[PDB]
Design a protein around this ligand. Structure first.
Ligand SMILES: CC(=O)N[C@@H]1[C@@H](O)[C@H](O)[C@@H](CO)O[C@H]1O
Ligand SMILES: CC(=O)N[C@@H]1[C@@H](O)[C@H](O)[C@@H](CO)O[C@H]1O
Ligand SMILES: CC(=O)N[C@@H]1[C@@H](O)[C@H](O)[C@@H](CO)O[C@H]1O
Ligand SMILES: CC(=O)N[C@@H]1[C@@H](O)[C@H](O)[C@@H](CO)O[C@H]1O
Ligand SMILES: CC(=O)N[C@@H]1[C@@H](O)[C@H](O)[C@@H](CO)O[C@H]1O
Ligand SMILES: *[C@@H]1O[C@H](CO)[C@@H](O)[C@H](O)[C@H]1NC(C)=O
Lengths: 376, 120
């Protein structure tokens, strides 16, 4: 399905970046979650790719990248390629990306996430630099999912009173050149702690906000940098450096990204519920807010609960622009005068049906109305 | 190349203790003062082992506090890592399909340590 997005480069210009795409349809199958992925990445002509990766919620960092545009620099370096709720990063080598598919479960292909960064990047093979005058605390900068998270102690409490604190930092590794900066003026000890200074962190827009907090105490303080743009092109044993000035002292720590599976990737559920006494239970699908009263396409894919097998009598029909309304499933779907579908189940049953419907109208947010039928 | 040229309250990074070797060093900002100038530093080798560093030491001071500066452009110049908004000592990068490839924004505005570079 088509969900356009706009992205602008921020801070410095690292070659690698993460383009979050939680917008495409995703279903809470809780069992078999096959998902065919096809990606197109433009550059400059357009070096279209043929990225293909079919991983359920069992392998979150797979990166099969059989290309067709030539020997491109890199694509979808996977360290958190699935980590998060629907987050599918597309990392490159340290650009008007047009993703095309997440799951099949029927016949509809589209996606989009436009980035205004350079179409073709530049190699950024950083020479090994150690910063001799930087005390290496060798703390473990574990990159949980994609966003970095550290609690390293700050540089020094030199001239704490009326200090134009600046926390400009940078992370280095396997040919990655990304440096963080601290925006919004110059923080000077506001409140006892949790200064919440916004961090540009370079990289990309970082839809989830990224910033560090200067947890001052009394006189030893700390620092809690949270730069989100951290991806797989880092080395397995790489080093980041933090430069905190006052009134310039640096600290070095070891960064190791983890390739693991997240808590969940499915789209957030509306968790709607209905109650029935008659087995011919029908549920009215609420109108999605982001879509007006008229739209050229809208689908109500009725999926069962805990499907141990592959797809079964589950209808993804009832679309607009001359769409087939005769659901091949065991169930039957209907609607009303207003565009609110009334979906009837295949006789339901004594057990809760817990059927899942993801009504994704065009240019509207996907609302997976996971409804758990309850008897009397 | 002997000894690196120091900057104002900045950083010199790592070079060990070489006998005129000093392969790679990096210069960082002074913190509250943004770095206005190319940060890289590699010791080029002349006919003799002893030589000079590739680039002069960049200045590390304020750049118009938080005020902005004119967009630096040249017909043979792109805007890599550059955008309409500006703050303090932010820089851009230049290139062309057919000169230097860097310029900053200082307090004097319209440039940083050096003027907006031209191109062939
Ligand atoms: C490797 C090294 O030199 N570490 C020192 C550290 O012991 C000292 O406490 C600090 C004082 O600013 O300077 C640095
Ligand atoms: C869009 C944005 O960056 N907002 C941040 C805000 O969240 C933060 O609390 C404030 C701290 O001064 O700086 C600004
Ligand atoms: C011990 C360890 O951290 N190994 C990880 C590896 O699992 C991951 O695939 C790679 C990504 O660049 O980074 C490293
Ligand atoms: C096609 C259909 O929905 N049939 C149902 C029927 O099974 C159910 O017993 C009745 C209860 O009033 O409602 C109607
Ligand atoms: C915009 C609008 O009027 N929506 C209504 C909806 O709230 C109601 O549940 C339905 C009943 O058939 O009729 C339509
Ligand atoms: C809304 O959807 C239409 C296609 O129906 C698209 O052309 C337009 O760019 C979209 N606008 C926004 C803000 O999503």
């Amino acid at each position: 399905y088509t969900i356009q997005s706009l992205i602008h480069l921020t801070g410095e210009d690292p070659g690698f970046f993460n383009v979050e795409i939680p917008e495409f349809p995703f279903y809470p199958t809780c069992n078999v979650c096959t998902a065919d992925v096809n990606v197109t990445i433009n550059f400059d002509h357009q070096l279209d790719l043929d990225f293909g990766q079919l991983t359920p919620h069992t392998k979150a960092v797979y990166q099969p990248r059989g290309a067709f545009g030539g020997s491109e620099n890199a694509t979808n370096l996977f360290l958190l390629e699935l980590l998060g709720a629907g987050e599918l990063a597309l990392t490159m080598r340290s650009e008007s990306v047009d993703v095309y598919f997440q799951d099949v479960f029927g016949t509809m292909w589209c996606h989009h996430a436009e980035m205004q960064n350079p179409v073709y990047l530049i190699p950024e093979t950083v020479p090994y630099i150690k910063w001799d005058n930087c005390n290496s605390t060798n703390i473990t900068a574990v990159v949980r999912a994609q966003g970095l998270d550290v609690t390293l102690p700050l540089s020094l409490p030199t001239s704490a009173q009326d200090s134009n604190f600046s926390v400009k930092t940078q992370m280095l590794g396997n040919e990655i050149d990304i440096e963080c900066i601290m925006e919004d003026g110059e923080i000077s000890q506001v409140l006892p702690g949790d200064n919440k200074f916004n961090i540009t962190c370079s990289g990309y827009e970082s839809h989830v906000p990224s910033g560090g907090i200067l947890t001052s105490t009394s006189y030893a303080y700390s620092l809690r940098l949270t730069p989100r743009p951290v991806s797989r092109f880092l080395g397995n044993n790489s080093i980041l450096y933090v430069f905190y000035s006052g009134n310039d002292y640096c600290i070095q720590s070891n960064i190791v990204f983890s390739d693991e599976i997240p808590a969940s990737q499915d789209m957030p559920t509306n968790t709607t519920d209905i109650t029935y006494v008659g087995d011919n239970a029908t549920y009215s699908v609420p109108m999605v807010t982001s879509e007006d009263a008229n739209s050229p396409n809208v689908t109500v894919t009725a999926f069962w609960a805990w499907p141990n097998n592959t797809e079964t009598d589950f209808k993804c029909k009832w679309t607009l622009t001359s769409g087939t309304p005769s659901g091949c499933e065991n169930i039957s779907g209907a609607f009303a005068s207003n565009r609110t579908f009334d979906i009837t189940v295949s006789g339901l049953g004594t057990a809760p049906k817990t059927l899942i419907i993801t009504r994704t109208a065009t240019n509207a947010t996907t609302t997976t109305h996971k409804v758990i039928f309850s008897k009397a | 190349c002997g000894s690196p040229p120091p900057i104002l309250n900045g950083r010199i990074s790592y070079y060990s203790t070489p006998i005129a070797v000093g392969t790679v060093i990096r210069y960082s900002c002074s913190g509250t003062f943004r770095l206005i100038g190319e940060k890289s530093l590699l010791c080029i080798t002349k006919d003799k082992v002893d030589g000079t560093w590739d680039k002069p030491a960049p200045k590390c001071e304020y750049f118009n506090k938080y005020s902005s500066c004119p967009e630096p452009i040249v017909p043979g110049g792109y805007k890599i890592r550059g955008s309409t908004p500006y703050r303090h000592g932010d820089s851009v990068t230049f290139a062309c399909k057919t000169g230097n490839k860097s310029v900053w924004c200082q307090a004097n505005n319209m440039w940083g340590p050096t003027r907006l570079p031209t191109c062939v």
